[PDB]
Design a protein around this ligand. Sequence first.
Ligand code: NI
Length: 341
Amino acid sequence: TCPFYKKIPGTGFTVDAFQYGVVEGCTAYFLTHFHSDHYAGLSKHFTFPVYCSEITGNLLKNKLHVQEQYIHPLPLDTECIVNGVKVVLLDANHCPGAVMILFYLPNGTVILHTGDFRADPSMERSLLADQKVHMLYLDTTYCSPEYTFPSQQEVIRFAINTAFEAVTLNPHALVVCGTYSIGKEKVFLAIADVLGSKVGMSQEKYKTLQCLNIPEINSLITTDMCSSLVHLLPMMQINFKGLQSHLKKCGGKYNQILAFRPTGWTHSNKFTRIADVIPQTKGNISIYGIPYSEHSSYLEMKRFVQWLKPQKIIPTVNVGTWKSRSTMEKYFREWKLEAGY
Ligand code: NI
């Protein structure tokens, strides 16, 4: 049974609610982005209307084989009427094709569902500026002050300089980047660009990247592993055993691996600056964990909410424990009292 926080009151609408069978009274199923916890339950046998971005719609069609007649892509930043309700999709600054949804209820209530997002000051000048929001369904993944991480720009800077130094020292070194879903493509694309290489990867991963409307992509990626000095692998294979094995595969073309694991937050963030980060090393293999987040830091989340001034907040993440729920409600009250709404 569908939880309350995936339902939009006063509508026939649900959000990211595909694993509950037929939801009673739902006339349209919205999908914020193509990550598995959110699409869980969709397949080629789905027969209700799905509303999403163009990119999410490319992945539904090609990866999950949802039939075209049930895919309803919408442009961003555009007022659209769905089953007699005005909606807008806004960029979520999460993975490719990820959206926030603004719903304009017939009784005059306005609701924003953030899906998954990384709040940014640029959102203060979207169509959100133009009117008041009564309810906010919030991505609360990192809603605690211990969750600090650097900007995406500083993290990419650190990775580019690290890779460039290593491969300029040893032209026979290979760079490997782990992946398990879309998102974080900047990590591998930036490193390949500085090394003047294409990124090599499996056929299934190449297919996924081909759905993403990235400019000049045929120039950046390939399935020819042996022509490439940046390889993508599944995240699970980014360990000493997995990498030793992969090094064998290239047929003595390479004598050193430098590998990156983009994680979200890790408790090394409560001590270490990005400048200061060091790998784990075993012989000719080094592994860097780098804190590339596609979710709001605590500070970025607080800033967005105190700017938005919602009348009520409904968390969509960390909702399964009483201790979590109680922590989150405390911070919402602090923020409201400090800003005065
Ligand atoms: Ni996500």
